[PDB]
UniProtKB/Swiss-Prot annotation:
Lineage: Viruses, Riboviria, Orthornavirae, Pisuviricota, Pisoniviricetes
Subcellular location(s) per record: Host endoplasmic reticulum membrane
Residues represented out of the complete protein: 1565 to 1881 of 7096
Gene name of this polypeptide: rep
Zinc finger feature spans (C4-type): 188-225
Activity regulation, short description: Inhibited in vitro by GRL-0617.
Name of the protein in question: Papain-like protease nsp3
Effect of residue 65 to A: Partial loss of ISG15 cleavage in vitro
Length: 322
């Protein structure tokens, strides 16, 4: 019997010494097994494998705890999905574009590029150590592990079409937003008013208008007493807000927003671009960069800086002048 020593892991930090029989596959001994993303389940150990680290699934109590502590998931397919994605994302390129880590287009990944660019411009701290560690590396230019984690957390495979709003939602669900608070009021014709308080992810996301200013002034909505009704922002406490809507032609004005995403083309037949407001408006499209003084396009998501906002207008005034 010929053997080699290898290490198994679920978090690539805590290692577990193993002695493997070179006459059996990794799968026969460990279950599903990966070497830096590559599936070696059906491969028998090589001499060159000695001392190397292999990912396995969290198939015993120790690994189950290590994987939960690192990733904050007990989804049994998570490690396989992460490794499957990493085998691709490690071959992607991550150019620095206008000082930010982007992603060269591959595998329908434009939604990931604009999400990654956005993260580098808003204040957001991740909760799972896995995302903390990988995002730090991404900021330094080595974003393969971070991108593979995004795929795994969002349950998207490489090549699958993704939505930026949904992707940000998943990332925010794995981020510390406990201090974020939103208070809204709805004026329902002359039938009454209703205030609502939102926290965390729900305090920083809105679907229906791209304009933060319009949300402060008021948006028209239905209520039980008709379509003469107005919803507006009373109070906001957060370091950013994200305003989203179905793609529509929209003008982005320098200095009035932080960054945005555009979706050109048709449904499930299109492409995302990133627009960032710096000294001028830069459009980052993967590895590509252009500039303009004004930008108009089919915008889907706009990000704004915030700290603390409180309205200085009474309900009836928003209802009648928004
Ligand atoms: Cl972080
Ligand atoms: Cl989390
Ligand atoms: Na950030
Ligand atoms: Na950086
Ligand atoms: Na959270």
């Amino acid at each position: 019997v010929r053997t080699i020593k290898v290490f198994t892991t679920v978090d690539n930090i805590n290692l577990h010494t193993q002695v493997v029989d070179m006459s059996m596959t990794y799968g026969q001994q460990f279950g599903p097994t990966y070497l830096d993303g590559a599936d070696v389940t059906k491969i028998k150990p090589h001499n060159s494998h000695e001392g190397k680290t292999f990912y396995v699934l969290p198939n015993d109590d120790t690994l189950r705890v290590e994987a939960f502590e690192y990733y904050h998931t007990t989804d049994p397919s998570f490690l396989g999905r992460y490794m499957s994605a990493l085998n691709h994302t490690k071959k992607w390129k991550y150019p620095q574009v206008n000082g930010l880590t982007s992603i060269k287009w591959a595998d329908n990944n434009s939604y990931l590029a604009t999400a990654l660019l956005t993260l580098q411009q808003i204040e957001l701290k991740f909760n799972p150590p896995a995302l903390q560690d990988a995002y730090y590396r991404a900021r330094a230019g080595e974003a393969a592990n971070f991108c593979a984690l995004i795929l795994a957390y969002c349950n998207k495979t490489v090549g699958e079409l993704g939505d930026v709003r949904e992707t940000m939602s998943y990332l925010f669900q794995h981020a510390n937003l406990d201090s974020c608070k939103r208070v809204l009021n709805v004026v329902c014709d002359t039938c009454g008013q209703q205030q609502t308080t939102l926290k965390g992810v729900e305090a920083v996301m809105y679907m229906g208008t791209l304009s933060y200013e319009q949300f402060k002034k008021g948006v028209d909505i239905p209520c039980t007493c008709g379509r003469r009704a107005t919803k507006y922002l009373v109070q906001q406490e957060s370091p950013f807000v994200m305003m989203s809507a179905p793609p529509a032609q929209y003008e982005l004005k320098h200095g009035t927003f932080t960054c945005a995403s555009e979706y050109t083309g048709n449904y499930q037949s299109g492409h995302y671009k990133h627009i960032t407001s710096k000294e001028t408006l830069y459009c980052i499209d993967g590895a590509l960069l252009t500039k303009s003084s004004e930008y108009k396009g089919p915008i889907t998501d706009v990000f704004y800086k915030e700290n603390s906002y409180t309205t200085t207008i009474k309900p009836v005034t928003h209802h009648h002048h928004h």
